[PDB]
Design a protein around this nucleic acid. Sequence first.
RNA 1: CGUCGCUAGUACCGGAACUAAAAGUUCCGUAGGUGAACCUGCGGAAGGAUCAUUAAAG
RNA 2: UGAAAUUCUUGGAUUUAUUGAAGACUAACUACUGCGAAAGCAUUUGCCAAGGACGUUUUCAUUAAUCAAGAACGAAAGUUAGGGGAUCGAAGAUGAUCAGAUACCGUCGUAGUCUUAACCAUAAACUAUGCCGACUAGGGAUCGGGUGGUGUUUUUUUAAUGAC
Lengths: 211, 283, 8, 127, 96, 21, 182, 56
Amino acid sequence: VVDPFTRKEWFDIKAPSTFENRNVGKTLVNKSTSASDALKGRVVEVCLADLQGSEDHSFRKIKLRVDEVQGKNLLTNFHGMDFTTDKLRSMVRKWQTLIEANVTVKTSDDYVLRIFAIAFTRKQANQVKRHSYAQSSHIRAIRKVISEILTKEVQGSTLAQLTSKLIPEVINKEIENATKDIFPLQNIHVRKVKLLKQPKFDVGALMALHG
Amino acid sequence: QHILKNPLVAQGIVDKAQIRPSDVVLEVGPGTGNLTVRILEQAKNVVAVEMDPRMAAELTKRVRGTPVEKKLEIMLGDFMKTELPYFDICISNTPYQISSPLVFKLINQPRPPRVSILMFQREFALRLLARPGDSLYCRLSANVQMWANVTHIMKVGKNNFRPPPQVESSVVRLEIKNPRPQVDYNEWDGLLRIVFVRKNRTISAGFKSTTVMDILEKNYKTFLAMNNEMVDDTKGSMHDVVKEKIDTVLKETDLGDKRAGKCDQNDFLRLLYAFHQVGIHFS
Amino acid sequence: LPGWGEWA
Amino acid sequence: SQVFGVARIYASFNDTFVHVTDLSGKETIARVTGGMKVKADRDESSPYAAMLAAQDVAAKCKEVGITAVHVKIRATGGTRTKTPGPGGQAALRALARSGLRIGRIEDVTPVPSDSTRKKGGRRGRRL
Amino acid sequence: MFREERKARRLKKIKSKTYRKIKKKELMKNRELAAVSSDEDNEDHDIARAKERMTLKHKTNSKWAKDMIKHGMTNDAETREEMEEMLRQGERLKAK
Amino acid sequence: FELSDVKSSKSLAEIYEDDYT
Amino acid sequence: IKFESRKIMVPPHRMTPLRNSWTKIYPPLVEHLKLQVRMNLKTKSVELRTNPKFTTDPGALQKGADFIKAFTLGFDLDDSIALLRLDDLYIETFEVKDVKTLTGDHLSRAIGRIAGKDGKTKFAIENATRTRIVLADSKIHILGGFTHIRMARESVVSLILGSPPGKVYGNLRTVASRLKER
Amino acid sequence: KFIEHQLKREERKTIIGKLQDYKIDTSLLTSSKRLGEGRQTKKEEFKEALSLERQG
RNA sequence: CGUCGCUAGUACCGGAACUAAAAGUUCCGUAGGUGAACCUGCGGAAGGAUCAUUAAAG
RNA sequence: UGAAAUUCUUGGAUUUAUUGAAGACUAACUACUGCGAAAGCAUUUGCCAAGGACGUUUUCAUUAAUCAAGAACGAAAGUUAGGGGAUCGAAGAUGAUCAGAUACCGUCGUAGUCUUAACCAUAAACUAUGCCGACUAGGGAUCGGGUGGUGUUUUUUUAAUGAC
Ligand SMILES: [Mg+2]
Ligand SMILES: [Mg+2]
Ligand SMILES: [Mg+2]
Ligand SMILES: [Mg+2]
Ligand SMILES: [Mg+2]
Ligand SMILES: [Mg+2]
Ligand SMILES: [Mg+2]
């Protein structure tokens, strides 16, 4: 007897200041009888290409969680990151070794998170062998180096600083420079970021992030 | 469909039927009538059940203009769906698809035949004939041996049937016991079904199942209700009572550690009586 | 080849 | 001036789901299925059923206010097939023809690292 | 080189008599049609006939053939064919 | 009537066009 | 008609044929479909865009992207070109392991059964069901009409389950009659 | 074998007599055929609900 | 064109009335089986017909 | 489903999103390539011992090959007594029993599938091919070690290593 969209009402979302394009679309919810309770805890997943306006990041997605509401504006915070499935399937190929590492670590902001990084062996310029398999000892050494690195950046940084590192993919270059002597590698990427636990809510820290 | 062509085996079947001249014969799966003409020869009258109207028409054509024409009667329908007349002897080479149910129908006829000669698949015939402690002893064996006695007449080969089937065959004799033993079909079948889920495991293991416990508890509550004694009816009210009843009866009967496949008629009868003593009714 | 690397 | 939605397409063997929701996904804008647009249960999975469902959702989305959608096609996944069937493809084609702008296309079929046994059994299934 | 290695490696494992039998017959046709095999000079025939007479390798006195005969293995059609192909091959060499 | 066991000279475009016409 | 883009990543093993078939692929897309075509060599993905001032058909962009995807999966160019010609052509896709968990030699022999000697068995299904089949290792793609691909799918599945090629060839022939009859 | 068979027959007769001592109907009792199900629809639940109502 | 039929229905006291009625794949080991001319669960074998593409850190 | 029907569903099914719980299994990389006496063995990291090959101008000096008797292990299934019980699933029940390419389909699902302490010792347990030893052709690919180069790349200070 009622069209819900009569009682539905629109809010617009705003992303953290770490990202260039703060406007990330709009969401709806039923009008308060409250709307804020439903709005909080909402997670929206969006490609980096939209937020940074560069197609170099077309294969990467951020999940952002709504954490505050102000005057129809939904202030969100970083909640996770991931790659597109098609990207991963393009990456994985025959005649090469997959090196996958995962590290559970907490930032300086008591943000507990988990980082998954992926790397591949590559054939040298003059190589004539078909494949580029790496011996298990090299695999273990590379994994140890990656773990030590990822722990080093995560521990000595804030979550916002961690994102500011993730966007320029500097961590991948650091991994490439660290593991260069062990074995040549290609397509070094931070595959995924999960946010396991959260600290106590601090609205001021979010207002500062959103300016 | 497969058709027999060996005359000697048909002659043996009709002979070992031992049809008295005053007997009426229920002849299932009449086929071309090779069995039927002989059975008409030495029978008072024959009642035949045919699935195929064409094939019964062929039978009528064969028997037409013959002295035994008046004796034959043909029924058209499904053997199971039909309600049958009184009959003294049952001789069948019916398709084995209805083999297992058929037997029980013969067992459950209001006036059962004194003797029946039935053709079955070899494995099924052996399971019917299986004795306690045998590998192929199963629920069917115990049930039929309660309601009848089954014996082996012949082993019928593949080559006799055309087109040759993928399994051997055999002919057996079934004799329903008159008077019938005065044990409920339902209770016996329920006990055997609960015990024969895995015939080579302990009976206690068979009763350990949760569904079995639930069924037995509901039946105990129903029995208490019938006796006018009040009952709570909640899910777990009598679990601790039924479990201890089962343990006590299994221990006292000494059947707890005996495998179902190695237990004979009397062991199951003792178990049934003890369960009725302690108040649990299965089916 | 037209369009190998530039808009065509 | 551009409002974005999310068009989740679930292409099963026996049916197709055209479910357009909000960017968060909690809010449903319109759900239309192959069954609702067809008289026979056999023809539910067909591309024709998928085609009709797309316009019905497409018409609804315009009325609400949505002008663009991000497509998320998927199959039944799990222990079953991972690739969307013709029903999903036709629905995707229909949305493009409907005039609604489409932002990005990605397959989100649930792909297990390693799964439980398939219902078929040792001898197989789908004779 | 890998590709023929994978293909050649896989064809090795298939040792079905029917599959090998069909492959040969296709191969023999191709050789005969293409005339890849050089014609035998009369001297070469004489050398070949010399060996067959001088050995008598293609008669039922061989170990394999004798075993099948004495144990009723040649009543079966397929083995009898495997015997007959051998005998005609000998008779071919015996031809003058 | 016998089925062809070799690549159809007709492309699938062509065989479907034959189907319409 | 609005400005839009597609991105279809071509796998490495299909790069060289695309370089081979490029002379015959951009003409139909840029002339008939009036679409603006590229690939990013850096990303190795063919990029197709709707040109608002020139493109007219709303469905051209999806039609072109699907046409590419057919070539990407392994279908021959002329086979894929039909997707541009027609509007009721779809691709059915599944793997061997979905039908039956076959491993080692069992998987390889199952593939051999589908393809048949010299590709005859695959071609019979191709001709009888009016479809096209690309057998990529344990990955099967079938292109054709919706009714047609279902018919082709079962014949493939029966071969996977163990049905001998000969009986499958016979069943194909009974099906072939009903197609001409209707 | 015969004499053991006769003893078994006598024991069977005694047990069957004591069984006739303890006998009831079976219409209300749930059959063991349900052992495999382990989960039930509403339709039977209505049937069971009606059955237990009839019993009281 | 008439009589009673047969099928369906409506009433009435077996009987006696009314209306309607377009038809003529091959197996191995193990474990089970109560619509068993055979089925089923688990693991294993070929003693079962390989076509296309394929250096894109090009 | 060939179409239906048992089945769930306005008390909201199916589908969407944020979580949580339980038990299995280690996709894609994956290759008859690697290891192990065989059966078998695939997520990260740590601990415990074990092992083939290679290098050795180190050590003992026949201590060796084969093996009735006898002993250790022996896929899957199975049995005894606990734990666990997600998925699939013998048995059993039940819906439908119309149509032959789709002709055995559906739902519930006991035992089992997992694990602990003992039994059982069977497979197309296959290279349908005993073990040790010598000799008898060319070729280039791969896995592990070792030797040689005044070879490329990296060490983006050199270099030395690593990768080719
Ligand atoms: Mg390896
Ligand atoms: Mg070895
Ligand atoms: Mg050593
Ligand atoms: Mg147990
Ligand atoms: Mg032992
Ligand atoms: Mg083995
Ligand atoms: Mg030697």
